[PDB]
Design a protein around this nucleic acid. Structure first.
Ligand SMILES: [Zn+2]
Lengths: 417, 511, 174
RNA sequence: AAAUCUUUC
RNA sequence: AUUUGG
């Protein structure tokens, strides 16, 4: 029973009738309408339902019996009540917004405000810091991009073969030969065999990164869609050879060799080793029953494999082709070559962008977009936006970055802007 | 291929990066950068501008939206077993429910009122006190943030205590209200394209544009700046408590607590950080760490740099450039007149995530592209046909479909390739209505939702409620049981199974 | 009594909190859909029972000549369902959640670079082609006769009554 | 063994 | 997570 709700409850029930003319709701704050001789259990009494209605603010319960119906007036001009009829009545009647005392304002000051302010004052504060000196210069020229590409090339060098990137082309073997080669390669590496599936066992890890080098570009990637679909399938079907129309792969779980009681079934976070076949003639050659093929491996995370498997190669290629300029032929190392270069290598680059889970090419593309729209850039800083070698680690992301830079250089050379 | 586009292309056709790396390294680097800025040797974190032209909304009622207080996103819950603090990761819904249980309160509004109404920091609000709440709310956990195009190294986000989340939500709601009051560009329902058009209009009077970004944005917005802005907009004790918690924040990395007194942790007070610069001067159109401004002479450029420095909005020299013929904001590029710059722009590809989800998302993307001048309609038709062919190649095995009737997508055993125009102008078999961007949820989306909701001892379902009942209504176990019983009885009276799905587009069309 | 464990110490919680409890996986969407043939079973169920009940809607026919123009923000104001309609839909067996979601007025800002002579509003995606879009506060409480309530008279002063002409409970204010 | 404090039922 | 994708 609070006086702040006398006006609020007075307007709640203007002239509501319940029997023929008699007021449905009797206000507990008015002597004439209040029921004498009975305790007050709410702001209003509803005769039709024989109930008590009480009004309380948002998050401010009032001391009334649980039987009393509570109508909450929210701070955003909305009302809540268990009885739909009372909610509708209050919504219709409270159209005229009258502010009720006790509403918690955003500027409310608590009794402990001063103490917390003193505590904040006693705590450490920052120092000013130096004002930067900014010099605006022209964007980088073809020479700077060539310098970046040459620096990357001389820092990391090149591989002898294209490794897994060569799996985008046919290996020259039929399904039976491919399955035999994959199974015999798995056997030759002493992979554990269990329930008709292969598992790679490891005990100790030399906690250092693997060798990083730039992969040369194969001639083309006819089976990019097939390879991506196979990797997508392998996210869960691991340990057995997976077949496609023109290629096959083997995703073997990589499992710790604890001992006799070692992990037997792959879990959610267990990594995969994807083994693929390509034409022979490199270091990673394997021969069995006269069948020769280059066997190339890739260690993939679960999330990496999932991300790689969902990419749409064909649609992406078409969308890029919609508004593209004449792509020039390029050599094995992403160099302009109109005598012996091939335009299909660009497809390979796209496949690389799909195989690289770090998507460094996206950062290179964003910086190149900034470059093409820029009149002036900060000196010696904008140029340090193509130096992303520190942000990535691995052969695939490194090659993706190198070929993104090569594409930028080729665009500057062939179609200056 | 993105390098040989005639127009502007950000290379968004592929998905963002993914990584399983732990967030410890990124969190450590962020904390180190924050400390270095705190010692004032690299960047500036001391706000100097005058925030006088900001309305004081001290008398505004305290407004809390419960929708953002509960979610499946991670959050940090703190326990005090035997005098030691233990931080655990749990869903924000569970954390908020635990917070409400600890301090007996029907809803967050009651908790806010109780916190603001006590007359001492040691008074009990249940099994806790304001002092304990402040002590617990300064603990954060580190998590990784990936799938961000152009960020090969995944960033570090931070999960906060439910009490901190509640106060932050209140303050951010009010800051967004003030921001909308300041300028019309910050209207809640404003697309990136609308903001870009507004910016193009604003900066049309000068020659050069200053497409710019701020570096170390989170690590440079100190608690002092947040408190200054909140006092300027009249936040009262809520702002003081939030600033105190921010200043004393600790982050649990691996198994050690690291103090990070400098700067905010992740993007949480985006509205407040924007409001700092916005109230400093009416010369920029900034959205957190993305601002655009124009100048005519080098003196104006120096003044702009001085304002940015005074507002703690350190310019990013790596990705800030000056343009005269183009404008860029919120990743949207326009010409100075206002036209959309020719090219793919921000167009993003649709990864394979279901036989029918992929088609629906591709239809939405192509509709967005064709409504603007990104591509002509025939190109979109060809792209949609190609996507249907790829979906047929990918999803046309017995493990997905066992049907062979027509009027079904070729990826579901049928032999129809619906044209984009036919689909868009509701000129298809009703089975295709779901594929429409405005149509009902596809079968795959419903299946995924069911699988997520079926993956235990759970409470009685409270779905399919009467539209007139507010979601703020207090309900007990008996109330939920009664509601479910009544709804099921009424549905049975209609001789009906689970309620029929309602689609606004179909309902309006057939009305 | 999971309610006693989920919300221990409180006998009442808001509907938002309760629903948040009632309502991530490394598996890809494709594998999830393949699992247990869930998608195949759902497709069979949809084609056998759900699909025949879908109301066929008319196709768009209106068109006007359009020409490429400067980028603009087309504003489509899709109105929300009125109490009378929302109540009729829920009482007819429609999903209450969807009706409640549609109860709120909606405004959509879409970028379009295409104009007509009369400056019409175009449908989603079909902007290039030119497919154009073109007292007492008597309240309807519910579509049923609540037990023990007054019958609606010829002159209902301010109460709530039941209408025979329209099978509903009508609330008359002022 | 590898895109190496990750491959930890 | 293999049952079940050419
Ligand atoms: Zn090799």
């Amino acid at each position: 029973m609070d006086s702040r709700f006398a006006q609020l409850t007075g307007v709640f029930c203007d002239d509501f009738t319940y029997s023929e003319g008699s007021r449905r709701f009797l206000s507990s704050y008015s002597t004439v309408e209040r029921r004498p001789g009975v305790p007050v259990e709410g702001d209003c009494y509803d005769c039709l339902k024989n109930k008590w209605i009480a009004f309380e603010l948002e998050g401010q319960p009032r001391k009334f019996p649980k039987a009393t119906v509570r109508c909450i007036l929210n701070n955003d001009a909305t009302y809540v009540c268990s009885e739909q009829e009372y909610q509708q009545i209050c919504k219709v009647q409270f159209k005229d917004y009258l502010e009720i005392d006790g509403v918690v304002k955003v500027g409310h000051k608590a009794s402990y405000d001063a103490e917390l302010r003193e505590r904040l004052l006693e705590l450490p504060h920052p120092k000013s810091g130096p004002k930067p000196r900014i010099e605006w210069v022209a964007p980088p020229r073809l020479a700077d991009i060539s310098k970046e590409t040459a620096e990357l090339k001389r820092q990391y060098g090149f591989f002898e073969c294209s490794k897994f990137l060569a799996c985008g082309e046919e290996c020259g073997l039929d399904q039976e030969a491919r399955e035999l080669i994959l199974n015999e390669y798995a056997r030759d590496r002493e992979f554990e065999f269990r329930n008709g599936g292969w598992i790679q066992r490891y005990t100790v890890a030399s906690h250092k990164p693997a060798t990083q080098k730039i992969l040369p570009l194969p001639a083309s990637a006819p089976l990019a869609r097939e390879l991506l679909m196979l990797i997508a399938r392998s996210t869960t079907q691991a340990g057995k050879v997976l077949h496609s129309d023109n290629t096959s792969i083997l995703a073997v779980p990589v499992m710790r060799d604890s001992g006799k009681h070692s992990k037997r079934r792959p879990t959610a976070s267990t990594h995969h080793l994807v083994v693929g076949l390509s034409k022979p003639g490199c270091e990673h050659d394997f021969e069995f029953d006269g069948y020769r093929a280059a066997v190339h491996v890739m260690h993939l995370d679960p999330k990496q494999s999932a991300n790689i498997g969902e990419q749409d190669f064909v649609s992406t290629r078409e969308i890029y082709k919609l508004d593209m300029l004449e792509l020039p032929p390029i050599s094995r190392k992403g160099d302009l070559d109109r005598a012996s270069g091939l335009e299909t290598r660009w497809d390979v680059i796209l496949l690389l962008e799909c195989l690289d889970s770090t998507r460094v090419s996206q950062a290179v593309a964003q910086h190149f977009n900034r470059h093409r729209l820029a009149l002036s850039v900060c000196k010696d800083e904008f140029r340090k936006g193509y130096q992303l070698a520190s942000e990535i680690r691995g052969t695939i992301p490194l090659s993706s970055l190198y070929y993104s830079l090569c594409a930028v250089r080729l665009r500057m050379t062939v179609h200056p802007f | 291929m993105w390098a040989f586009q005639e127009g502007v292309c950000k290379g968004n056709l592929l998905s963002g990066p993914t990584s399983m790396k732990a967030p410890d390294s990124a969190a450590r680097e962020s904390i180190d950068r924050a400390s270095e800025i705190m010692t004032g040797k690299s960047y500036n974190a001391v706000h100097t501008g005058d925030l006088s032209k900001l309305p004081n909304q001290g008398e505004s009622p305290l407004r809390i939206v419960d929708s953002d207080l509960y979610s499946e996103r991670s959050c940090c819950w703190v326990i005090e077993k035997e005098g030691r603090v233990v931080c655990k990761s749990t869903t924000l819904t569970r954390g908020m429910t635990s917070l409400l249980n600890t301090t007996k309160c029907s809803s967050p509004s009651e908790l806010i009122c109780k916190v603001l109404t006590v007359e001492s920091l040691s008074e009990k609000i249940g099994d806790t006190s304001v002092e304990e709440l402040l002590s617990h709310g300064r603990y954060f956990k580190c998590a990784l943030r990936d799938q961000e195009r152009g960020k090969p190294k995944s960033r570090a986000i931070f999960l906060s205590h439910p009490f901190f989340r509640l106060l932050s939500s209140v303050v951010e709601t009010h800051a967004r209200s003030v921001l909308s009051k300041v300028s019309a560009v910050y209207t809640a329902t404003a697309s990136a394209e609308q903001r870009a058009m507004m910016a193009a209009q604003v900066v049309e009077s000068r020659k050069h544009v200053l497409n710019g970004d701020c570096t170390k944005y989170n690590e440079a917005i100190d608690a002092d700046t947040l408190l200054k802005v909140w006092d300027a907009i009249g936040m009262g004790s809520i702002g003081v408590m939030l600033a105190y918690m921010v200043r004393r924040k600790c982050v649990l990395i691996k198994d050690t607590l690291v103090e990070c007194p400098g700067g905010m942790l992740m993007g949480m007070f985006n509205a407040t950080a924007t409001l700092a610069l916005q109230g400093t001067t009416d010369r920029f159109l900034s959205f957190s760490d993305d601002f655009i401004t124009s100048f005519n002479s080098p003196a104006e450029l120096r003044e702009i740099e001085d304002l940015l420095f005074a507002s703690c909005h350190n310019l990013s020299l790596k990705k800030s450039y000056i343009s005269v013929a183009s404008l860029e904001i919120n990743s949207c590029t326009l010409t100075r007149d206002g036209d959309l710059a020719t090219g793919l722009g921000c167009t993003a590809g649709v990864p394979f995530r279901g036989p029918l989800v992929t088609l629906k998302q591709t239809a939405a993307m192509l509709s967005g592209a064709v409504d603007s001048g990104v591509m002509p309609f025939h190109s979109a038709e060809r792209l949609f046909q190609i996507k249907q062919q790829e979906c047929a190649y990918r999803y046309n095995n017995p493990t997905y479909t066992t049907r062979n009737e027509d009027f079904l997508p070729t990826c579901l055993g049928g032999k129809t390739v619906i044209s984009f125009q036919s689909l868009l102008t509701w000129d298809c078999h009703p089975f295709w209505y779901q594929v429409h961007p405005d149509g009902p949820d596809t079968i795959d989306q419903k299946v995924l939702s069911v699988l997520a909701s079926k993956t235990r001892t759970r409470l009685e379902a409270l779905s399919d409620l009467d539209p007139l009942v507010p979601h703020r209504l207090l309900v007990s176990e008996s109330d939920v049981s009664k509601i479910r019983a009544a709804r099921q009885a009424h549905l049975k009276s209609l001789g009906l199974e689970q309620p029929t799905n309602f689609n606004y587009a179909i309902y309006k069309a057939v009305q | 009594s999971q309610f006693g464990k989920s919300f221990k110490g409180r006998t009442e919680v808001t509907i938002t909190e309760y629903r948040s409890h009632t309502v991530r996986s490394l598996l890809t969407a494709d594998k999830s859909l393949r699992k247990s043939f869930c998608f195949r079973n759902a497709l069979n169920q949809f084609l056998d029972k759900d699909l025949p009940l879908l109301p066929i809607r008319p196709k768009l026919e209106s068109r006007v000549a359009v020409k490429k123009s400067k980028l603009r923000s087309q504003l489509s104001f899709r109105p929300g369902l009125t109490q009378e309609e929302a109540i009729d839909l829920y009482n007819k067996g429609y999903d209450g959640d969807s009706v409640s979601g549609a109860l709120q007025d909606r405004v959509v800002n879409e970028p379009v670079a295409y104009s007509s002579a009369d400056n019409d509003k175009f449908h989603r995606g079909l902007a290039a082609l030119g497919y154009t879009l073109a007292k007492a506060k008597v309240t309807v409480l519910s579509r049923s006769k609540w037990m023990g309530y007054e019958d609606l008279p010829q002159k209902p002063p301010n109460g709530t009554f039941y209408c025979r002409k329209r099978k509903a409970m009508l609330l008359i204010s002022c």
